Write a protein that binds this ligand. Structure first.
Ligand SMILES: *C[C@@]1(O)CC[C@@H](OC(=O)NC(C)C)c2nnn(Cc3ccc(OC)cc3)c21
Ligand SMILES: [Cl-]
Ligand SMILES: [Co+2]
Length: 369
């Protein structure tokens, strides 16, 4: 009936009637000629539509409340000296409990990113990884929760040295300015341009060197679909892209990455993250270890992302060759860590937003960010 400390009560038990709290609700921006969009908020036609999707928005809100409680707990104990494995296991244990993990009905949407320094995304440790979080590290915590395949993608940056404080502010401001710009009929490239303009208004000094903060050109916000983290609409963080448009009822991950490096990421380091190709259909496999592994993936993850550690915990071993086989057949795709140049520093902030008929909801907003 109230949440414990450390948190252990499922979000579903704290809201016994099943109605989960709304995120930050916002009027859409005015149209570019100048007209207002407040009418959506009082329209019967829009209120009807919105109600027809209530159970959906409610599933996102449950997932979002789990994400707020997990991240508040992580900020309380994450410290240099902890191993990356210990941080991810402690976060994931809490997430499993709060989301009340139940197969594909509720669970973890994707592995815990905890990318360091010049690495921006897609690092989680594999077994045996001895990496320890240090005092000068800049660490992107990116973790996802879901209810019925309704995904919260939300991310923040942890530091301990105040030298990064201005970089964190830039990226936060840039992300908030993306969120503000977003709305129905807005051009995706318009959201990108707003993000860029803000991001580059920021100069930062880090150990006696000055930089203008750059958005990472090839990391992008994106639409979200059911059991589909990246559903094909992509949002730049630089100027230049398609001028296509956000539509009513869609869900977006609005993320920005800021960098003191080239502002471009390349694959580097060993792969931890994998995910079935959403568009591959059924493929009969006779090779027995490869068949078994695909069954394990279909059972436990479907089209959601997973990592090596999550196979290990299911009791699978000596599966690397079978995993490679699935990648080589195109059934599974690998997602290796994405890093800017050696020596650079990268930061991230991200929320999930719902483009409801009646209002824009930053479903994952907290008091924290
Ligand atoms: C994978 C990542 O965290 C970072 C990449 C990003 O995709 C893009 O920016 N794509 C461009 C069009 C090149 C992205 N979108 N969602 N996430 C969350 C996530 C997805 C998959 C996964 O494991 C496979 C983990 C996290 C990201
Ligand atoms: Cl400094
Ligand atoms: Co993310």
């Amino acid at each position: 009936k109230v949440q414990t400390d450390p948190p252990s009560v499922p979000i579903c038990d704290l809201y016994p009637n099943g109605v989960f709290p709304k995120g930050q609700e916002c009027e859409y921006p005015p149209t570019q000629d100048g007209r207002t969009a407040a009418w959506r908020t009082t329209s019967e036609e829009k209120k009807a539509l919105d109600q027809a999707s209530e159970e959906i928005w409610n599933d996102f809100r449950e997932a979002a409340e789990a994400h707020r409680q997990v991240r508040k707990y992580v900020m309380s104990w994450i410290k240099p000296g902890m191993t990356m494995i210990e941080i991810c296991e402690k976060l994931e244990d809490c997430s499993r409990k709060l989301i009340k993990e139940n197969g594909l009905n509720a669970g973890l949407a994707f592995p815990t990113g905890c990318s360091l320094n010049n690495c921006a995304a897609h690092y989680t440790p594999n077994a045996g990884d001895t990496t320890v979080l240090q005092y000068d590290d800049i660490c992107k915590i990116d973790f996802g929760t879901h209810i019925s395949g309704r995904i919260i993608d939300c991310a923040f940056t942890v530091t301990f040295n105040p030298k990064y404080d201005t970089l964190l502010k830039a990226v936060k401001d840039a992300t908030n300015t993306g969120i503000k710009c977003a709305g129905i009929d807005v051009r995706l490239c318009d959201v990108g341009e707003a993000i860029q303009e803000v991001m580059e208004s920021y100069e930062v000094e880090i150990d006696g060197k000055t930089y203008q903060v750059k958005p990472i050109r090839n990391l992008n916000g994106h639409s979200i679909g059911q059991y589909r983290i990246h559903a094909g609409k992509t949002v730049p963080i630089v100027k230049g892209g398609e001028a296509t448009r956000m539509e009513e009822g869609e869900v977006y991950a609005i993320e920005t990455f800021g960098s003191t490096g080239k502002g471009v990421v390349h694959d580097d380091m060993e792969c931890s993250h994998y995910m079935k190709n959403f568009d591959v259909g059924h493929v009969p496999i006779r090779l027995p270890r490869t068949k078994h592994l695909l069954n394990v993936i279909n059972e436990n993850f479907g089209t959601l992302a997973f990592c090596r550690r999550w196979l290990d915990r299911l009791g699978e071993s000596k599966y690397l060759m079978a995993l490679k086989n699935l990648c080589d057949l195109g059934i599974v795709d690998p997602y290796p860590p994405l890093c800017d140049i050696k020596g650079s520093y990268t930061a991230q902030f991200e929320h999930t937003i719902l483009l409801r008929p009646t209002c824009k909801e930053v479903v994952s907003r907290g008091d924290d960010y």
